[PDB]
Design a protein around this ligand. Structure first.
Ligand SMILES: [Co+2]
Ligand SMILES: [Co+2]
Ligand SMILES: [Co+2]
Ligand SMILES: [Co+2]
Lengths: 321, 321
């Protein structure tokens, strides 16, 4: 009936059109050490984040799921400032990123102590049912992430703790897959530990261009996310649309959701992409799906009711019991 | 004639008895994501840090070098509070930890952009000559760290940038060696990039029990640090003293400094070591050198002049041009 947002409990039937995977803030672990030259400017960052929220609102978006990992600069209070200013529903996550772009030393040390897995479960439960730090904000999803070609022993601790927390709370699980790998493996591992398939979204599935890889993942009954639209230079958007069309014709519309995985404000030092990498990444923004991708899908005969199923129907079903 | 402390510029002649490597605060990368259950209690942390500083003062210590890495919870403003309350001189560092227990993803990403090495140099220069963030505090040393049996490509970026920054500023370099490896390799690599041996301290050298390994490092004209006194169970203190006595009998006192590498306040969740691992670690405190180690050295006939050279003479010479 209800889902926890950065502005408290909100009725699931009031979520409406949703983007399942976007970041208002994000930083690669280690950004904190570059504080001198890469200070977080809160006033300017809020202006940019509000601008992004208003851009999404213009295309009918009422809800955004922001799955920024705990070790990647997650800031629930900042998200609340964006939500209070715009009226946009923002759902945040509890969880850590994968090894390659995460900060494993902390929980690797606690693994040696023999408490890590219990500590992670304790963290999940606290942030889902009590609140994150002193913010008073509860996470609405659990964020999981795996490495390229494997779910590491470090990562598996989080996977097992997430499934355990999922059993107790009924919380949604949002995942990260690295370079189009471990899609079926994530689904299998979670269901083996008792997680609800109708509460799991396997993310970054667009990173793979083989439809059989998708069908294998979809067979577990889980949701999949084509959530990297705009990121190319990694498959192209043309390849993403091609894969998506093949699945929609097979009738997998009730298991697919779309997003950009944007980073609207980068934490740490500002940077500029070289050419032609910057030109290839020009469409990586929150309006891309609505300005470019959806029109391209409708040019390929995708009806409004199919698009509404992905953006409105699926998120509503995902967060409902 | 001056060195930057957390309270500003202090005459090198006034540094006196010094501990070359201690941490008031330290956290393994990833501790930030465990904020809900492992909150930073500043009032209690300050009390413990001040009590630690008063314990050092009891044994004549006037100066402490705190080389907490930028990615390991370095807090210059907190150190200033400790220094203002106790009158102790605290010198902090600029730099990142080694890959295994650091947060590489940030500068690894900037390496793909092609700016990382220049960004690191820029960071070093900013924090040595301008100030850290908005604290107004300048770092007095550059902290470098390498992995077990390898100075990785990531780590080398910092080593080269440190050598660049050292030539421009004359700043002291303090290093971390992992599990008694890379001592000679660190010295050799820094010197071939133009670093001043009289401004380099190769740390954690007591991690190796072979005196030939030390002599190979000492051959470069650098300082070495026996800075793990009290850490046992994971070489022993008996082996550390045996190695030290061999080097002092060879007449290397003008190149050796001693410390504990204590972590007085752990960032993140509190933890307890099992038995008999905790019993072996019971001497890991800031008074260990003065209550246990120095008396043991004096039992073996080590003169006060030699001890004063290590604790007073060497730090004075290190920070002097
Ligand atoms: Co991701
Ligand atoms: Co993401
Ligand atoms: Co160290
Ligand atoms: Co240390």
């Amino acid at each position: 009936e209800m889902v926890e947002t950065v502005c408290g409990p909100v009725p699931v039937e009031q979520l409406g059109k949703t983007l399942i995977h976007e970041h208002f803030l994000f930083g690669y672990p280690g950004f904190q050490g570059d504080v001198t030259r890469g200070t977080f400017r809160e006033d300017e960052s809020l202006r940019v984040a509000v601008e992004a929220a208003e851009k999404m609102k213009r295309h009918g978006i009422q809800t955004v799921v922001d799955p920024t990992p705990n070790d990647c600069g997650r800031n629930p209070a900042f998200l609340r400032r964006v939500a209070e200013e715009t009226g946009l529903n923002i759902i945040c996550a509890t969880g850590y990123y994968y090894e390659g772009e995460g900060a494993p030393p902390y929980f690797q040390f606690r693994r040696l102590l023999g408490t890590a897995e219990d500590d992670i479960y304790d963290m999940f439960m606290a942030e889902l049912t009590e609140g994150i730090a002193d913010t008073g904000i509860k996470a609405g999803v659990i964020k999981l992430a795996s490495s390229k070609g494997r779910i590491t022993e470090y990562e598996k601790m989080f996977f097992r703790a997430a499934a355990r927390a999922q059993k107790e709370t009924g919380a949604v699980i949002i995942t990260h897959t690295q370079e189009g790998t471990m899609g079926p493996e994530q689904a299998a591992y979670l269901l083996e530990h008792g997680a609800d398939p109708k509460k799991i979204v396997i993310g970054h599935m667009c990173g793979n261009t083989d439809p059989d890889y998708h069908r294998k993942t979809l067979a577990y009954g889980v949701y999949i996310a084509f959530d990297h639209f705009g990121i190319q230079g990694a498959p192209t958007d043309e390849e993403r649309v091609r894969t998506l069309l093949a699945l929609l014709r097979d009738g997998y519309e009730k298991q697919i959701m779309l997003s950009h995985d944007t980073v609207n404000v980068w934490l740490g030092r500002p940077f500029t992409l070289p050419e032609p990498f910057a030109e290839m990444m020009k469409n990586w923004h929150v309006e891309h799906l609505f300005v470019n991708i959806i029109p391209a899908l409708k040019n390929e005969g995708i009806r409004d009711e199919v698009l509404e199923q992905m953006f409105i129907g699926n998120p509503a079903a995902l967060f409902s019991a």
